[PDB]
Design goal:
heterodimer, A: about 260 residues, alpha/beta, Rossmann fold, Cytochrome-c3 Hydrogenase, Chain A, domain 2, five-stranded parallel sheet, two-stranded antiparallel sheet, 12 helices, about 30% helix, globular, B: about 550 residues, alpha+beta, Cytochrome-c3 Hydrogenase, chain B, three-stranded antiparallel sheet, 14 strands, binds morpholine-4-sulfonic acid, binds iron/sulfur cluster, binds carbonmonoxide-(dicyano) iron, binds FE3-S4 cluster, 3 iron, 4 sulfur cluster binding (chain A), 3Fe-4S (chain A)
Chain lengths: ~260, ~550
């Protein structure tokens, strides 16, 4: 029987691999079921068996596949010095991503880095790192966060394969996951409304679970679904007593800092 | 029974090194089928140290955590310890406990994923698993590991059926062009052992979800925890009964998998590859220690770490020297940085990027070259294991001796790629053996005391250092504060020690030295290079930052 699961090519550029790690925390489905039954994951540096020329050959085989492919991009693109500060197989990352993007059926940027540039783009941006759309002028489906919830990434992949392109907001994020403010679903919202705030982390107010706004919480300006879905089926930062950093917002490293203040 | 080895003479480049974190190019020179020279060439720079200049010291941990998402948490911890030291705050006992438990959870998650998902495909021919007799595999499994339903013939056959369907689909995915396809002389395992390992590879994908959930009970989320603050931690809920009960339950499930699957698979593989106890050795080891009972200062961390700190040189296990933090420095001679930056202690660190060209043997890596009293140091599980064993740490003596007896090898056999791999498993078993004690300590402390963050004030000018032994080894962050802002912030990371380039005297780093003598059965499929490189568990985003 001639069979085909949709081909996915996953590139790693200027990244910390936290997005790959987030993806493999999926439980609906687990990552094994996804890659055995739903997609054909045809290049993925972190887990693939081939290395070196054999890995580069696997990439080229996938890019030239007659069925086409979807492109997942993890990491920003370091553009300084002709792209030479980020290279795979002796090629600038920007060159390979540009080539893969040009023929992709669709492009999904997993994480704030590929979506918007991320941590390496933070001032003064030594490597002149750029988001994928920023660098290439192509439209992307952005699944930001540092890292995004697997629910949002795997949910987006499954949506793209079975329904089409989900409705995106002005920052390219699927409204299914990014349509609401963190704050609007936060269990500390009744404290915020009553102006009941923790003034410091050691305070009795912090012990009582008062709102973290005075300690810098960016929940009120951050679009994500963290309190609704949780992470790892158990927790999220505010439940662990810590303010939201705003990590799914473009350029948050510069727009949401200092993290413990309301700048 | 001789180790397979071709007559190949010539260069081999492997780029990308897959099944690591980050972007590494390895170049070797081979003569008559053995590596005679080696270069570890890290291929991405981000520049987090440069980005941090002028920022609020409170923000450092959030930036530096993004040095790496495989070893998530550990840089947030090192930065928090560093700023705590710079502001001269001693964190409350509960915060020491919580921070150290989150580290323990990280070791469990990280080492399980490493062995199965990064390293095992260098030793296990997955396609050969399709040829195994599942009843013979079940019988073997019952002889080498505790009874478990996942090791039944029915369970193993279901794995074989899934893999057969995948392989026959024509889309090999992550197995495309695998070095074992079509047979490879360097792969020794019986098909039955391939099948058991493959079944456990799939189970481990599910088990790592549980290990990350345990970590997130305390850490807020995984990846990239969010529960540390200057002066301690924020997670009051993590001190309480039901969360800690769930943390214990999940941790016990993970540890059951460590004891039932990881250790027996590791020992089974080790038994077939005993020749690899004579390949890939180095001589000097460094650890800052981890799991300290007193984290009030870097010196107290070094002194009180339950996985002890120390320095071993020249494979001499009869003497472990104290770590002198003033003796650490980094060279840039063979790195992509400006000339003039050799010999810098991290408080005087300079990060001035200067690229030349691919494969310039004068400047071939974005990593700096950390050195200690003029020597390269291997860091990580093998370093911790030798230091602890040499000092007679009782858990390490027990578990190391168990392995030495099972394999019929001396402690000296651990100076090798097989040894490095074994040590990672040994310490995972030891963390597991301590989880109930550490959880009880924190549960009892949290029940009687909810102090979790100490009071502190930002100094105008100060310096501080934060030490940790992360899953890959000795991690240090070093801050100079001036005008209440970051004036210098330097990371020196375990993969920097292990996989950096040559130092100022032209001396090979641990991975470069370890690669000398590697046999190559097939230069087109140089799995032996991967076995050694992967045994160091490289993280290039960590190493370069
Ligand atoms: S803050 O600026 O006070 N915050 C209040 C409510 O929503 C966004 C910002
Ligand atoms: S978005 Fe965050 S977690 Fe993902 S690659 Fe970038 S730094 Fe890492
Ligand atoms: S803790 Fe943050 S997200 Fe929650 S109510 Fe307060 S400001 Fe909003
Ligand atoms: N473990 C780990 Fe990552 C590396 N090398 C850090 O620190
Ligand atoms: S820091 Fe990020 S993970 Fe959610 S809670 Fe805030 S958007
Ligand atoms: Mg550094
Ligand atoms: Ni890492
Ligand atoms: S395909």
């Amino acid at each position: 029987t001639a069979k085909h699961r949709p081909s996915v090519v996953w590139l790693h550029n200027a990244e910390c691999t936290g997005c790959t790690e987030a993806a493999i925390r999926t439980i609906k489905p687990y990552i094994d079921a996804l890659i055995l039954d739903t997609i054909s994951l045809d290049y993925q540096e972190t887990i693939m068996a081939a290395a070196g020329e054999a890995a580069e050959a696997a990439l080229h085989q996938a890019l030239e596949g007659k069925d086409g492919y979807y492109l997942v991009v993890e990491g920003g693109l370091p553009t300084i010095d002709g792209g030479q500060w980020g290279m795979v197989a002796g090629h600038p990352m920007i060159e390979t991503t540009k080539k893969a993007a040009a023929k992709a059926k669709g492009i999904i940027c997993i994480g704030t880095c590929s979506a918007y540039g991320g941590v390496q783009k933070a001032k003064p941006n030594p490597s002149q790192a750029k988001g994928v759309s920023e660098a290439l002028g192509v439209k992307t489906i952005n699944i930001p966060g540092c890292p995004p919830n697997p629910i949002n990434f795997v949910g987006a992949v499954v949506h793209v394969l079975t329904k089409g392109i989900p409705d995106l907001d002005e920052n390219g994020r699927p409204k299914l996951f990014y349509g609401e403010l963190v704050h609007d679903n936060c269990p500390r919202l009744p404290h915020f409304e009553a102006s009941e705030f923790a003034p410091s982390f050691d305070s009795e107010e912090a012990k009582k679970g008062f709102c973290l706004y005075e300690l810098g919480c960016k929940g009120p300006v951050t679009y994500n679904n963290c309190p609704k879905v949780l992470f790892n089926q158990v927790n999220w930062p505010v439940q662990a007593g810590h303010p939201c950093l705003g990590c799914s917002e473009p350029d948050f490293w510069d727009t949401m800092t200092p993290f413990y203040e309301q700048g | 029974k001789p180790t397979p080895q071709s007559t190949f003479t010539g260069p081999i480049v492997v780029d990308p090194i897959t099944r690591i974190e980050g972007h590494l190019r390895i170049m070797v020179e081979v003569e008559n089928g053995k590596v005679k020279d080696a270069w570890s060439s890290s291929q991405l720079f981000r520049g987090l140290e440069i980005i941090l200049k002028g920022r609020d010291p409170r923000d450092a941990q959030h930036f530096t955590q993004r040095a790496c998402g495989v070893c998530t948490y550990v840089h947030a911890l090192a930065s928090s310890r560093c700023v705590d030291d710079a502001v001269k705050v001693s964190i409350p006992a509960n915060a020491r406990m919580m921070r150290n438990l989150v580290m323990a959870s990280q070791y469990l998650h990280d080492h399980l994923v490493h062995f199965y998902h990064a390293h095992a495909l260098d030793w296990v021919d997955v396609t050969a698993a399709l040829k195994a007799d599942p009843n013979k595999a079940a019988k073997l499994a019952a002889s080498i590991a505790p009874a478990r339903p996942g090791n039944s013939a029915k369970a193993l056959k279901a794995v074989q059926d899934k893999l057969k369907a995948f392989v026959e689909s024509g889309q090999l995915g992550i197995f495309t062009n695998a070095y074992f396809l079509g047979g490879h002389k360097a792969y020794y395992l019986p098909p039955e052992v391939d099948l058991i390992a493959t079944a456990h590879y799939l189970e481990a994908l599910h088990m790592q979800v549980k290990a990350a959930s345990a970590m997130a009970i305390l850490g807020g989320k995984n990846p990239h925890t969010q529960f540390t603050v200057v002066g301690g931690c924020s997670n009051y809920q993590g001190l309480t009964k039901d969360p800690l009960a769930n943390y214990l339950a999940l941790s016990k499930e993970v540890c059951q998998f460590v004891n039932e699957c990881y250790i027996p698979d590791l020992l089974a593989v080790a038994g077939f590859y005993k020749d690899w106890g004579g390949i890939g050795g180095t001589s000097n080891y460094l650890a800052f220690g981890e799991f300290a009972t007193d984290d009030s200062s870097p010196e107290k961390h070094l002194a009180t770490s339950q996985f002890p700190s120390g320095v071993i040189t020249g494979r001499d296990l009869g003497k472990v020297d104290n770590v002198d933090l003033g003796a650490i420095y980094e060279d840039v001679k063979y790195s992509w940085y400006a000339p003039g930056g050799d010999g810098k202690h991290p408080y005087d660190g300079v990060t001035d990027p200067k690229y030349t060209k691919l494969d310039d043997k004068d400047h071939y890596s974005w990593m700096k070259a950390p050195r200690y009293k003029g020597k390269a140091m291997e860091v990580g599980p093998l370093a911790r294991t030798f230091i602890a064993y040499a000092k007679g740490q009782p858990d390490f003596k027990k578990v190391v001796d168990m392995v030495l007896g099972k394999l019929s090898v001396p402690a000296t056999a651990l100076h090798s790629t097989l040894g490095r791999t074994a040590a990672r498993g040994i310490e995972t078993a030891i963390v597991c053996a301590n989880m109930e004690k550490w959880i009880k300590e924190m549960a009892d402390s949290g029940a009687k005391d909810n102090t979790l963050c100490a009071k502190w004030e930002m100094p105008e000018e100060s310096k501080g250092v934060g030490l940790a032994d992360a899953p890959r080894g000795a991690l240090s962050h070093w801050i100079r504060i001036k005008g209440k802002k970051i004036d210098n912030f330097q990371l020196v990371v375990p993969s920097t020690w292990n996989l950096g380039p040559r130092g100022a005297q032209g001396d090979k780093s641990p991975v470069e030295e370890a690669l000398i003598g590697t046999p190559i059965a097939d230069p087109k499929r140089p799995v032996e290079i991967l076995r050694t490189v992967h045994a160091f568990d490289p993280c290039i985003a960590c190493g370069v930052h």
